[PDB]
Each structure stands twice: as C-alpha cells, then as structure tokens.
C-alpha cells in the first residue's frame, strides 16, 4: 500500500482550506454551544438563525487568525508544532490576558 | 482670562470623604480630571449608540445603566449601578 510521509497531507490540507471559505465547524454543534452559554446568561432566549451564523463567522475568523499568531510563536521557538504555550504567548501579546 | 472648567473641586471633595488627611499633587489631579472626562465620554457614547439602535430620541438613566454594564468590568459595574440607582431614588424622593 501507498503512504504519504508525515507532513505531506498536512500541507495539502493547508492549501485546500486556505483556498476555500466555508465554515469548518459543523452548524448544529456550534449552535448548541451558543444556546448553552447564552442560557447561562438569560433563560428563555430565541435566536434569529442569522444571529448564530454571525457568531460562527466571527468565531472561526477569530480562531483562524489566532492560530496564525500561534504558528508564528511556535516557529519563533524553532518548532513546527503549535503548543498551548504558543497560544498563551499570542493572547498575552494581543492583550487578551 | 477665559474660564477653564474642571472636575478638580469635586474630585477633591470626594478625596476628603475617603482620606480626610490626604492631599493630591497638581499632576495627579490632572490625571483624575482626564479619568472623569474619558469615563464620561465612554459611557455617554455607549448610551448614545443604545438610543440610536433602539430608534429612541432620549438618553434616559436606563441607557446609562446598560452603558455601565457594557463598559465596566463585573464587580465595578455592580456597585456603579447600585450607586446610580441609589442617587436616582434619593433624587426623585425629594420634596
């Protein structure tokens, strides 16, 4: 059988998703998360379905650009693997923590 | 010659209540004056947006109150709201 070497399929994935624009998290799970969190603030809320889509577009863009910053933090440490400490440096320099 | 208005005297009044034997330098007072103006502007601007978002012509204490909750961190908001309400109740219940 044929096998791609570790890193080859990952690079293929980067090209593919950097080329496309669809949301990468399934819709129903993200919607339950939004509902749960918001229920904890205020019971008996409804959501316009576009309110949830707006939250998902914002959330994914937030996370994509945080991973870019995290990636730069890993590479700064002479690694290719992102670690929680890369995310934490990124958020600290951003003034999020 | 022109009058230059400032929160200085009121900041000083409040300082006397809180630390009767503590003074304050010129520069610190100027810092406190920027603080009051900045916070005024932030709260007023948010209250303004809220009114416009809701197609209302008036900034009422309710817009202020929601503005305080959007802008101030948790516990700060809680005590600010209660001071705000306290002062409004006191003021209305005045003959």
């Amino acid at each position: 059988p044929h096998r791609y070497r570790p890193g080859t399929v990952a690079l293929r994935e980067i090209r593919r998703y950097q080329k496309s624009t669809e949301l990468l998290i399934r819709k129903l799970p993200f919607q339950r998360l939004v509902r749960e969190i918001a229920q904890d603030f205020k019971t008996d809320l409804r959501f316009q379905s576009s309110a949830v889509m707006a939250l998902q577009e914002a959330s994914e863009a937030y996370l994509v650009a945080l991973f870019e910053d995290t990636n730069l933090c890993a590479i700064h440490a002479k690694r290719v693997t992102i670690m929680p400490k890369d995310i934490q440096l990124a958020r600290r320099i951003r003034g999020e923590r | 010659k022109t009058r230059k208005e400032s929160y200085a005297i009121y900041v000083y009044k409040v300082l006397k209540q809180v630390h009767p034997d503590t003074g304050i330098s010129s520069k610190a007072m100027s810092i406190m004056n920027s603080f009051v103006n900045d916070v005024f502007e932030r709260i007023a601007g948010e209250a303004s947006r809220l009114a416009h978002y809701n197609k209302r012509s008036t900034i009422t204490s309710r817009e202020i109150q929601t503005a305080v909750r959007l802008l101030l961190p948790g516990e700060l908001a809680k005590h600010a709201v209660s001071e705000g309400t306290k002062a409004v109740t006191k003021y209305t219940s005045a003959k």
Partner: protein
C-alpha cells in the same frame, strides 16, 4: 434654591453633567435622571481610585497622592486595570516585576 447634587446626595455636579450631555450631541433629548445617574457613577469610580491611591500613598509613607500612586492603585487592581487597559498614566512608571527565569541561580 437647592442644587440637584445635594438633592441626589452627591459631591459631583449633576448640573454640569446635564449640560455636558446636552451639548455633546449624544441624542436630541436628555431625561431628568440620566445626569444624576451618570454623576453618581463618576463619583463612585473617583472614590474607588482615590481610596486605593490614598492607600498606596500611605504605604509609601506619604500624605500627598502623586501620579505614581494612581498607577499603583490602578494596575494592582484587576478591574481598574482592565477598564484602563489602554490608558497611559503620565509619570506613573510601571509595577516592579522581574521574570523568574532572569533571577540569579539561588
């Protein structure tokens, strides 16, 4: 002939706050209680900072609050630090803080 500040039980000028809200183009109309409410919050936050700043003066053996004491007050407080996270206090300096990896090997 009694001030709205005294009526509301405040040190901060409810009258001035009213004017500043009118001439600030915040909305066409301003309600009676908005300036009382806003004055109260402003007074409250002033008291909050002055308290802690006063305390920092005390610990440093001083009776006059300078900018340094304001900075210490604000940045040693999680909530004031956050509200003023993008503000610079002139002549404030910074908090003493050295990263532990930089300390000599005890």
């Amino acid at each position: 002939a009694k001030t709205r500040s005294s009526r509301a039980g405040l040190q901060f000028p409810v009258g001035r706050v009213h004017r500043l809200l009118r001439k600030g183009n915040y909305a066409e109309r301003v309600g009676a209680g908005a300036p009382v409410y806003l004055a109260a919050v402003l007074e409250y936050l002033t008291a909050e900072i002055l308290e802690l700043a006063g305390n920092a003066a005390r610990d440093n053996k001083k009776t006059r609050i300078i900018p340094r004491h304001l900075q210490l007050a604000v940045r040693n407080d999680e909530e004031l630090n956050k509200l003023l996270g993008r503000v610079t206090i002139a002549q404030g300096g910074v908090l003493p803080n050295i990263q532990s990896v930089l300390l000599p090997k005890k």
